Design a protein around this ligand. Structure first.
Ligand SMILES: COc1cccc(-c2c(C(=O)O)ccc3ccc(OC)cc23)c1
Ligand SMILES: COc1cccc(-c2c(C(=O)O)ccc3ccc(OC)cc23)c1
Length: 134
């Protein structure tokens, strides 16, 4: 048993708050916000040795990242930003920081009861996305 055991699995989005405004804050245009906002992605988290893989799949877009904790990597986000990302574990929370064009946003992933809770923060705007086991 290891670092991210309680995250591993397939998770389905069930609820969202303030995600349109989060997207606005990160620069997403109107049409992409409206289409992406409908999506109910599946987030599939797996671990192989030190490598964590997070796949996020929806009608809108499929994304896949693999990484080692603390080790920066290139990411193309679902909204097509080209960012430098680092993911760390801080007190049992996966903390995903994305840097691009002098800007920064943080996505936190946390296990809470039987849910996986995702908080996306850009400046003063926070959005919460709640996932259940698929
Ligand atoms: C893979 O399908 C989707 C569907 C819906 C939203 C997202 C998504 C995630 C995510 O769920 O990993 C994280 C961050 C985002 C930031 C901006 C964004 O603008 C469209 C979309 C984001 C991905
Ligand atoms: C790419 O990754 C990072 C990591 C840490 C810091 C920054 C960063 C910040 C920031 O987020 O505080 C602000 C302004 C910057 C201006 C130039 C810059 O050189 C590429 C990096 C800047 C970027």
């Amino acid at each position: 048993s290891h670092m991210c055991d309680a995250f591993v699995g397939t998770w389905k989005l069930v609820s969202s708050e303030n995600f349109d405004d989060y997207m606005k804050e990160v620069g997403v245009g109107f049409a992409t916000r409206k289409v992406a906002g409908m999506a109910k992605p599946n987030m599939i988290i797996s671990v192989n040795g030190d490598v964590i893989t997070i796949k996020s799949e929806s009608t809108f877009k499929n994304t896949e990242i693999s990484f080692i904790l603390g080790q920066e990597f290139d990411e193309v986000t679902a909204d097509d930003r080209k960012v430098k990302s680092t993911i760390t574990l801080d007190g049992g929370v996966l903390v995903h920081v994305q840097k691009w064009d002098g800007k920064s946003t943080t996505i936190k992933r946390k296990r809470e009861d039987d849910k996986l809770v995702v908080e996306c923060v850009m400046k003063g705007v926070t959005s919460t996305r709640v996932y259940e086991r698929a």
